[PDB]
CSV table of C-alpha atoms in Angstrom, one decimal:
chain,number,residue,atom,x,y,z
A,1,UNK,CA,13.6,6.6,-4.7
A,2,UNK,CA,14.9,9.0,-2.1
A,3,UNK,CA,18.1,10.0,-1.5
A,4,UNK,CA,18.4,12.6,1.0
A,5,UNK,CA,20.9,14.6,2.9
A,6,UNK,CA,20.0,15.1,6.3
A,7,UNK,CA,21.2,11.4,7.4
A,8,UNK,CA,24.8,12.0,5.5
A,9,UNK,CA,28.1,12.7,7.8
A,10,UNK,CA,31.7,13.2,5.9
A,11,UNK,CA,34.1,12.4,9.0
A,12,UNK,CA,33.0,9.7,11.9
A,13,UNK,CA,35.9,9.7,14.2
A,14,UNK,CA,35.6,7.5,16.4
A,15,UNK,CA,37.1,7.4,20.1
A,16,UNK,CA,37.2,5.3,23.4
A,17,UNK,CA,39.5,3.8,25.9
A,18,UNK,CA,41.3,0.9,25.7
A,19,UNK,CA,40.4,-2.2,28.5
A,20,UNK,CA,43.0,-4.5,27.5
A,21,UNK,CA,44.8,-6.6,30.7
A,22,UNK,CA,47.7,-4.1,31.9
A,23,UNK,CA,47.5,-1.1,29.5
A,24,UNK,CA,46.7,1.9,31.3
A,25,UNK,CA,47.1,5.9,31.4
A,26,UNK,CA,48.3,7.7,27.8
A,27,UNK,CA,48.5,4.1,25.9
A,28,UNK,CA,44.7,3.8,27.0
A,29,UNK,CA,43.5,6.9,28.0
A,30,UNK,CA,44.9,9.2,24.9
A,31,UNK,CA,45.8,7.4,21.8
A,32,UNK,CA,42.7,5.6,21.0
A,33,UNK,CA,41.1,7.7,18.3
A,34,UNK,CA,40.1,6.8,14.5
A,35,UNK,CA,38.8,9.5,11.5
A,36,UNK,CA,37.2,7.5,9.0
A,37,UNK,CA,35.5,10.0,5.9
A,38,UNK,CA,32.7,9.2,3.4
A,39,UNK,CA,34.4,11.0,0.3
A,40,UNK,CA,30.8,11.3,-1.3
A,41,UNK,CA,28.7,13.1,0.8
A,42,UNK,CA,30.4,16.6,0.8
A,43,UNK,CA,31.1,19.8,2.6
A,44,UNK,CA,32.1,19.2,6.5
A,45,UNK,CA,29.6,17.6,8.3
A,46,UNK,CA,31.3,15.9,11.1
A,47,UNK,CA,30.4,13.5,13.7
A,48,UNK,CA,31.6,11.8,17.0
A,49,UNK,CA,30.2,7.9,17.2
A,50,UNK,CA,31.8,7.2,20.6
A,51,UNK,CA,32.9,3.3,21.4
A,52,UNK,CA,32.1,0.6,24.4
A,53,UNK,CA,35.0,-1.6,24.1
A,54,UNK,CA,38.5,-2.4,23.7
A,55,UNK,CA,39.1,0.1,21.5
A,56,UNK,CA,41.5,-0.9,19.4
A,57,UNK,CA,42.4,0.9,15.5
A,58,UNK,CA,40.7,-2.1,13.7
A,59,UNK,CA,37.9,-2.1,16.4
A,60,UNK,CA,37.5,1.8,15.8
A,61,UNK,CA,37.7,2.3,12.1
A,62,UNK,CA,35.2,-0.9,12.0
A,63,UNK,CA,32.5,0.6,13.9
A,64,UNK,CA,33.0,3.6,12.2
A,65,UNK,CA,33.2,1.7,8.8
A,66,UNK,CA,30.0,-0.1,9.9
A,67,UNK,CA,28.0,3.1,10.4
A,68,UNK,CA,29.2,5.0,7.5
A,69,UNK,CA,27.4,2.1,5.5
A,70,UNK,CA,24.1,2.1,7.9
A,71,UNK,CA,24.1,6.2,7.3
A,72,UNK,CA,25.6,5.3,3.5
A,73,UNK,CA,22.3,2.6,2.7
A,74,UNK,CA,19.8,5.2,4.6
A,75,UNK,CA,20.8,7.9,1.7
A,76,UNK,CA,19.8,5.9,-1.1
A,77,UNK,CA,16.4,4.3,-0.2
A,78,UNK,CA,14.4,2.7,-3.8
A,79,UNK,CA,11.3,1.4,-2.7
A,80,UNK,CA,9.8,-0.9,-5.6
A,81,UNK,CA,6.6,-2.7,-6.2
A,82,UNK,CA,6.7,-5.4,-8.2
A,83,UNK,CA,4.0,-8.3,-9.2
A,84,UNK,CA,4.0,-11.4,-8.7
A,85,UNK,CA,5.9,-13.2,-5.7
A,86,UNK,CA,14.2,-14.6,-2.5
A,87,UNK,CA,15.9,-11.3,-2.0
A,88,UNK,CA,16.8,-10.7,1.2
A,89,UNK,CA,20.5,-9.9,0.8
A,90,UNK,CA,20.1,-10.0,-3.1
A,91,UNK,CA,21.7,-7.5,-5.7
A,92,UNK,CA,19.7,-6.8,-8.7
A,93,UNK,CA,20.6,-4.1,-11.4
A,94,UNK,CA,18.0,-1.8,-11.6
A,95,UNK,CA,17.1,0.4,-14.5
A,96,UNK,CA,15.3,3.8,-13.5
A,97,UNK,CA,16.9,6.4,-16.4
A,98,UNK,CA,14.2,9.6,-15.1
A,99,UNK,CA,15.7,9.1,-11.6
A,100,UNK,CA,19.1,8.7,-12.9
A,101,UNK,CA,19.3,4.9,-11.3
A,102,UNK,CA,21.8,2.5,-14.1
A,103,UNK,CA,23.3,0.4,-11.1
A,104,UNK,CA,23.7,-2.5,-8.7
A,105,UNK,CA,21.7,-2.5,-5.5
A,106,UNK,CA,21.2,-4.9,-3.0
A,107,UNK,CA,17.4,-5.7,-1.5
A,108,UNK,CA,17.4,-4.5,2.8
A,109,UNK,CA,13.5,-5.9,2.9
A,110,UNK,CA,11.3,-7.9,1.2
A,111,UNK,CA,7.0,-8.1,2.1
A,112,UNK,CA,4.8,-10.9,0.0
A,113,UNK,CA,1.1,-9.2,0.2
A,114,UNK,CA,-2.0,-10.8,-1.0
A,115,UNK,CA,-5.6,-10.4,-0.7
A,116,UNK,CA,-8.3,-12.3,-2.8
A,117,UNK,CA,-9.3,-9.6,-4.9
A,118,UNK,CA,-6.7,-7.4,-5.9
A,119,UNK,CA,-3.2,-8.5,-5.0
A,120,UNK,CA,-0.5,-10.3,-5.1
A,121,UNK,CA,2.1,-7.6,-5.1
A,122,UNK,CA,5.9,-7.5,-3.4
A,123,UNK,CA,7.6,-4.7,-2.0
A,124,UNK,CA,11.2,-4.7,-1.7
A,125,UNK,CA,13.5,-2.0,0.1
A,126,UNK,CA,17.1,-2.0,-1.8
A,127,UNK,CA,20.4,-0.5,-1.1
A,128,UNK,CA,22.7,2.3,-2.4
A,129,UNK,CA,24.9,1.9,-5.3
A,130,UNK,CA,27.2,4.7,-3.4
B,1,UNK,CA,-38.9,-22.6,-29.9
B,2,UNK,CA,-42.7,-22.8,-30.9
B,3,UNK,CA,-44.0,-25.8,-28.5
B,4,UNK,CA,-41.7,-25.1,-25.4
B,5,UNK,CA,-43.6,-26.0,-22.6
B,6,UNK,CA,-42.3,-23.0,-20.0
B,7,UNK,CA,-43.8,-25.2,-16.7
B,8,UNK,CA,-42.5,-28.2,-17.6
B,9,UNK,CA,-38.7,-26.8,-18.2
B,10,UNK,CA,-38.5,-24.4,-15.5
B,11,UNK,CA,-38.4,-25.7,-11.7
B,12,UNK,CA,-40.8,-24.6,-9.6
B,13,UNK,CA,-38.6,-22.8,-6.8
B,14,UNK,CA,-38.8,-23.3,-3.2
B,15,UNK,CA,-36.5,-21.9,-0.2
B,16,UNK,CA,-35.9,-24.0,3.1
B,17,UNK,CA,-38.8,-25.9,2.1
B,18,UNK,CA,-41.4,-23.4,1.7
B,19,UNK,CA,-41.9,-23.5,-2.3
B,20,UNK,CA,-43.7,-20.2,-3.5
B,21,UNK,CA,-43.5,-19.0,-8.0
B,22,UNK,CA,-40.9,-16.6,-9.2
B,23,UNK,CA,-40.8,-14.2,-11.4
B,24,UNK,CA,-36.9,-13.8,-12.9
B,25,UNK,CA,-34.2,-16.0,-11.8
B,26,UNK,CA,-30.4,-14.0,-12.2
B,27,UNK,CA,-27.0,-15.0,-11.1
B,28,UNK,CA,-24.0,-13.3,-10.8
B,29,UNK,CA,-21.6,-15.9,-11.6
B,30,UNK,CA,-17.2,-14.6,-12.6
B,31,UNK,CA,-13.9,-15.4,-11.9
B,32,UNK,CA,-11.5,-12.8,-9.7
B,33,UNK,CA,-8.1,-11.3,-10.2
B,34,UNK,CA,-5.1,-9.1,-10.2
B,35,UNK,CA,-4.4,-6.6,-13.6
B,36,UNK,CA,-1.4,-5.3,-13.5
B,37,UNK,CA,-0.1,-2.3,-15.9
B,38,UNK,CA,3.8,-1.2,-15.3
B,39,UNK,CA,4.9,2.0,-15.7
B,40,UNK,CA,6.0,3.7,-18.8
B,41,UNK,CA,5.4,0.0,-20.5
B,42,UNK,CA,3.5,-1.6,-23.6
B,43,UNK,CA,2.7,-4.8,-21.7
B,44,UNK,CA,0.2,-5.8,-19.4
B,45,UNK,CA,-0.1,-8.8,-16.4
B,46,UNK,CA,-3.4,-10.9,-15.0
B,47,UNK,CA,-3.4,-13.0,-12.1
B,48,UNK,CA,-6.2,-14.8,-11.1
B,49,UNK,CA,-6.9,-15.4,-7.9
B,50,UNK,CA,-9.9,-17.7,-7.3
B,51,UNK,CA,-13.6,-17.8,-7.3
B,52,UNK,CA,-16.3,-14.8,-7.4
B,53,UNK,CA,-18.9,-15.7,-4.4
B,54,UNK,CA,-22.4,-16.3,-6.5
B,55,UNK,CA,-25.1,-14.6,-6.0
B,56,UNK,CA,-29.3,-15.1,-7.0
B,57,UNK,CA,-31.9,-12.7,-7.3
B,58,UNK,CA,-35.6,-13.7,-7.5
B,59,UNK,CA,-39.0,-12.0,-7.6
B,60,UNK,CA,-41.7,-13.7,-6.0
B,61,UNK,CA,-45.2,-13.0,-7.0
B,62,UNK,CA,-48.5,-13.7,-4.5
B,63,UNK,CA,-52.1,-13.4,-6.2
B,64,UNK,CA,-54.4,-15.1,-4.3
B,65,UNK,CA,-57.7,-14.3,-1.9
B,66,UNK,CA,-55.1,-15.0,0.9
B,67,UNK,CA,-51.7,-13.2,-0.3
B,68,UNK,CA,-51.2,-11.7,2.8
B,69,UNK,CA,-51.3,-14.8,5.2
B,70,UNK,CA,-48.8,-16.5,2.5
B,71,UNK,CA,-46.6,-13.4,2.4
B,72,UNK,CA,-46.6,-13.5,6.4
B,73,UNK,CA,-45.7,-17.1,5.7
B,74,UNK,CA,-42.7,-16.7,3.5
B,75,UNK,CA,-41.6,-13.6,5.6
B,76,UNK,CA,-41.3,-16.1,9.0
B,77,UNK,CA,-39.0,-19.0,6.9
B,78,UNK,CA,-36.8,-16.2,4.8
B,79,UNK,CA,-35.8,-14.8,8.4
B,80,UNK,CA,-34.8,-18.5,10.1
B,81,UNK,CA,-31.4,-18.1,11.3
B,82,UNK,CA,-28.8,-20.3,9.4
B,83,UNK,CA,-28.5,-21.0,5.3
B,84,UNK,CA,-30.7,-23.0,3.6
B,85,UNK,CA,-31.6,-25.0,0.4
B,86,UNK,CA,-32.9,-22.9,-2.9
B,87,UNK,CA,-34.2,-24.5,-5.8
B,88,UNK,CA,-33.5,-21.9,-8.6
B,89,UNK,CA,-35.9,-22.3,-11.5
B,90,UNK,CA,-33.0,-22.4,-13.6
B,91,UNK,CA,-30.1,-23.6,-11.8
B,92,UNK,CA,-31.4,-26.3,-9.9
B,93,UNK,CA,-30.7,-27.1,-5.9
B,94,UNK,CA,-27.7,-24.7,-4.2
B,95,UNK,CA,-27.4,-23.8,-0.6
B,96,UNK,CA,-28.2,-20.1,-0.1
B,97,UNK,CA,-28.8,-17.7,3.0
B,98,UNK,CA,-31.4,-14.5,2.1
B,99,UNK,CA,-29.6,-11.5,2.6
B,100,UNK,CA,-32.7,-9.1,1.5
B,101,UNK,CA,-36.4,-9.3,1.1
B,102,UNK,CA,-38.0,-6.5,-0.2
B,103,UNK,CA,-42.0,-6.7,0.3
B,104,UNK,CA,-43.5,-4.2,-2.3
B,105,UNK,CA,-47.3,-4.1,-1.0
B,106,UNK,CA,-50.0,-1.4,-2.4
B,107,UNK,CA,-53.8,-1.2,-1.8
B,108,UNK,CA,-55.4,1.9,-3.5
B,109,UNK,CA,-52.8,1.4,-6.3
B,110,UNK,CA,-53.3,-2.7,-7.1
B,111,UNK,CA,-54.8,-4.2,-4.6
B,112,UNK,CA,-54.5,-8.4,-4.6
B,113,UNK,CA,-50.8,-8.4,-5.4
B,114,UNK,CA,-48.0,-8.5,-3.1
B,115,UNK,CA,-44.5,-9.0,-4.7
B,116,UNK,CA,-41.2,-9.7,-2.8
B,117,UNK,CA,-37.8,-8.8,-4.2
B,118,UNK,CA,-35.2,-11.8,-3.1
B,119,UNK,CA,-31.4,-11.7,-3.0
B,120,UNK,CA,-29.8,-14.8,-1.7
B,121,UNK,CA,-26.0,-15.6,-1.8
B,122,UNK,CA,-24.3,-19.1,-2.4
B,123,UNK,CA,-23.5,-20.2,1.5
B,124,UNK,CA,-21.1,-22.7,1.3
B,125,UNK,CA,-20.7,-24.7,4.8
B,126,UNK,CA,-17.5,-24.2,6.9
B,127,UNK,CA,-15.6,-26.6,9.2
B,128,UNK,CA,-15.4,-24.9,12.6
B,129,UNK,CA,-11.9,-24.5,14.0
B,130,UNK,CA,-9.4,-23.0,11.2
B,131,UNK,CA,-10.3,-25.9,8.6
């Protein structure tokens, strides 16, 4: 398990313009803007994801919302393998107590190995319990 | 036992045809497979995974006013290309390629004898293509 800190951000505000049919200067120029925040990371570490269309609020605070769960899953990554060989958006709970892990993750990857001699062995990549 | 006949319950072995007398006669029969042993637990896993290749391993003795034309002999079959058919004294008729010949050969030492150290391998046949 690795949980790191260098792939963490607190505010993602994201910004644009807006290319709806008519709307033009201030009303799509200006407004468009969106601050989403991560209330788990900590101290300011702030960010600028910038957008490529029709920025609207939902359509901002979604593509922020969508990478503040790619950086959120990055900065919790449990790599486990297990022995013998269905998990590819599975959630397992997973019981590590030295590592502090007592929670609910869901499996990013999933690799069947085998090799007749010593094998049979899969290696799944899971997600955070944030 | 105290009338067992040794010649008439061991088979005389032959490779590829050429039939020469052994020595010892060995295998190296087993069955493969995983072990697994989880952390920080009292429990253990197997998992076997198929079939260990066999393997025989002969010693061929020559000890005869003409060792060395029969050694030459048995040199000239043991390197034809391609696997062939073994008659293990003790196992009967297999398929086997030689894989090493070692040809121990003194003359100020013993003089007379010539021995040759064998390793074959079970070489099952294949169908060409991706079977």
């Amino acid at each position: 398990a690795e949980q790191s800190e260098d792939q963490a951000n607190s505010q993602i505000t994201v910004k644009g313009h807006r290319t709806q049919k008519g709307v033009w200067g201030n009303d799509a120029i200006v407004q468009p803007v969106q601050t989403v925040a991560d209330s788990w990371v900590g101290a300011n570490i702030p960010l600028t994801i910038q957008h490529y269309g029709d920025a609207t609020n939902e359509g901002l605070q979604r593509r922020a919302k969508f990478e503040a769960d790619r950086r959120a899953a990055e900065s919790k990554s449990v790599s486990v393998t297990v022995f013998h060989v269905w998990d590819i958006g599975t959630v397992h709970y997973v019981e590590i107590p030295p590592e502090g892990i007592f929670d609910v993750l869901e499996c990013v990857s999933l690799t069947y190995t085998v090799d007749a001699k010593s094998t049979l062995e899969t290696k799944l990549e899971l997600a955070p319990p944030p | 036992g105290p009338c067992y006949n040794p010649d008439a319950e061991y088979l005389p072995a032959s490779f590829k045809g050429f039939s020469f007398d052994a020595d010892s006669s060995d295998s190296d029969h087993g069955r493969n497979g995983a072990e697994a042993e989880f952390v920080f637990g009292e429990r253990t896993g197997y998992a076997d995974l198929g079939i260990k290749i066999k393997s025989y391993q002969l010693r061929a003795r020559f000890q005869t006013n003409d060792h060395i034309a029969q050694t030459n002999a048995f040199i000239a079959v043991l390197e034809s290309p391609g696997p062939g058919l073994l008659v293990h004294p003790t196992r009967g008729t297999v398929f086997a390629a030689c894989r090493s010949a070692r040809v121990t050969d003194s003359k100020v030492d013993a003089a007379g004898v010539t021995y040759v150290e064998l390793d074959f391998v079970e070489a099952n046949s294949v169908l060409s293509g991706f079977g």
